[PDB]
Design a protein around this ligand. Structure first.
Ligand SMILES: O=C(O)C(=O)c1cccc(O)c1
Ligand SMILES: O=C(O)C(=O)c1cccc(O)c1
Ligand SMILES: [Fe+2]
Ligand SMILES: [Fe+2]
Lengths: 335, 335
């Protein structure tokens, strides 16, 4: 339902830049950071898009030229795909599954190399696609440390304090090609997704939709991603995917999205809309209370499930025995 | 394959006193207690019938008259069934399953009351059936404490020592009516089943046949019994019951059966063969080694399964949420 930019510059995007999927969605509310309803949503761990935080104001000038000039000669992680659809592997979990080959590999490189791959691809119709995903640190240049220093630390530190969250664990810079998709997954941390350049579509699903989204086993390298291909969903294997309902929004420069911990997210950079730049802020969640309430919340049951899987992997001495044990435990007994 | 008693007294039983079932079995070996192969079997936790231990020699004179005279005015637990098939409930686990009524109840009573129920039933064709099952203690009479004192404690204490087992936890006296069946279940302790009067058929199945025998959930009051009705097995729900294979034997006066911990057992007092008397000896098993070997043994995986179920019951605050969580964790992910 497209936003009109200030100065009559016409709709920022239209519906033809959105991919189409099998499930319905409702909109994540767009609110002011001074609106108490926004504070309610965050405190109840539900998503909201805050339109006026100024969280990353000084990075609103970033583009590829400014960045290439000012970032430094660091190594930037740069992921790859032959399709629009990216797949992250945990390279430590690779010991596990023999019957396995990378199909979206990390390449290390310097920024200018990326800017030139990027723009070479462009001049050859390439379905060959790249995603830069790299922690900001100290190895970055002077003009970028200054920018970063001007982020709205007052606001975000108040949020960490008020919500009782733990420490800021990381801050990634993400630079996407148009059409790029990061398929549905969930993160264990609380997230502020700070949009800087171009437009990203975010479809979220809550923690109680675990059973419709069929993540990989915990020991699999794609731990926490959905096994369901959103473009060609296999309802024979994943029959509850036909009961999935999402929350969605499109965020552009200046918007911040609160992605609550354990919420599923699918993130797509709009078709024909250019390069997208985003920065994220990840925090450890509050510690669990002493006072346990019953019944537990979906995320807590999700946490227990992960733990059963992790323990069983260690007790059996081999993650390939986890499946057969689980199946033996449940058939003819709990169905 | 029937044993001929000493003094030409003819076969002790014939095959027509055995019920018939759907699965094949092989015989548990009958050996001398002085045979090293018997010591091998016990040390490897496999069943053996020891024919000459004298473990309960002085109780070989017990019958209902001698016992009624000499046991005392104690309360004897006495279980009931309208069918040949008994069902034990754990009365503490009854809080759990609302949708539940006893169908094989404990009645307390004095021995003479039992002897008279028993013999009244007899004079009225009754499919109404009783099983006395009660720990020996100190409240028993003088002539029975003397008998008990003459059990072969030398031999059985040597076995506890050599196997590294823990303490003797209990010693039950069991007095069964003919035709009685105790359906397949497993116990967590090591067991010497000491037969005294009449004949009992014992079909055992090892720990790695868990998946064919479909025990009740751990929180169910019939925890550790098979859900499969051996007389009318439901292969739609319990399809791997058609791969079950058993070890079987018939034990009579003077025989002792080693039932290894976690081994399934089904125990039937022969049709038309009279009242049966048995005493058992249960021991805690050895503690697990420091040196863990991989892969684990079937009983150890059975122990892990029980623990996952127990924990999850407590973490969720409600055992009815265990099933749905387990199912959500496994479908489309580990099948
Ligand atoms: O923040 C995240 O959890 C995330 O998964 C993400 C953030 C920015 C772009 C993108 O493709 C993915
Ligand atoms: O010893 C046992 O584990 C047992 O289950 C048992 C012992 C004697 C008679 C009977 O019906 C059952
Ligand atoms: Fe994420
Ligand atoms: Fe038993």
């Amino acid at each position: 339902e497209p936003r009109e930019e200030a100065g009559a510059l016409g709709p920022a995007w239209d519906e033809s830049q959105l991919r189409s999927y099998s499930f319905p969605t409702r909109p994540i509310p767009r609110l002011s950071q001074s609106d108490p309803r926004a504070e309610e949503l965050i405190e109840n761990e539900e998503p909201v898009v805050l339109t006026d935080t100024n969280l990353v104001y000084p990075a609103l000038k970033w583009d590829l030229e400014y960045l290439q000039e000012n970032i430094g000669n660091g190594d930037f992680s740069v992921y790859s795909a032959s399709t629009h659809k990216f797949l992250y592997y945990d390279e430590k979990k690779m010991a596990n599954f023999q019957n396995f080959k990378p199909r979206s590999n990390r390449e290390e490189m310097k920024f200018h190399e990326f800017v030139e791959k990027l723009q070479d691809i462009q001049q050859r119709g390439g379905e060959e696609r790249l995603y830069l995903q790299q922690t900001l640190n100290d190895t970055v240049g002077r003009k970028i440390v200054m920018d970063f220093l001007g982020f709205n630390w007052n606001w975000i530190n108040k949020q960490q304090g008020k919500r009782g969250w733990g420490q800021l664990t990381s801050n990634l810079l993400l630079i996407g090609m148009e059409g790029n998709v990061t398929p549905a997954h969930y993160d264990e941390q609380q997230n502020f997704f700070a949009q800087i350049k171009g437009y990203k579509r975010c479809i979220l699903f809550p923690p109680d939709q675990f059973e419709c989204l069929y993540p990989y086993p915990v020991h699999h390298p794609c731990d926490r991603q959905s096994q369901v291909d959103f473009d060609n969903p296999d309802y024979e294997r994943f029959p509850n995917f036909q009961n999935v309902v999402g929350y969605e929004t499109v965020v552009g420069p200046g918007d911040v999205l609160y992605i609550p911990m354990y919420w599923w997210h699918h993130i797509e950079s709009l078709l024909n809309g250019g390069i997208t730049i985003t920065v994220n802020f990840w925090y450890k969640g509050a510690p669990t209370p002493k006072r346990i309430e019953y019944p537990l919340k979906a995320h807590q049951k999700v946490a227990i499930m992960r733990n059963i899987e992790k323990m069983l992997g260690e007790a059996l001495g081999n993650p390939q025995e986890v499946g057969p044990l689980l199946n033996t435990m449940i058939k003819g007994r709990y169905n």
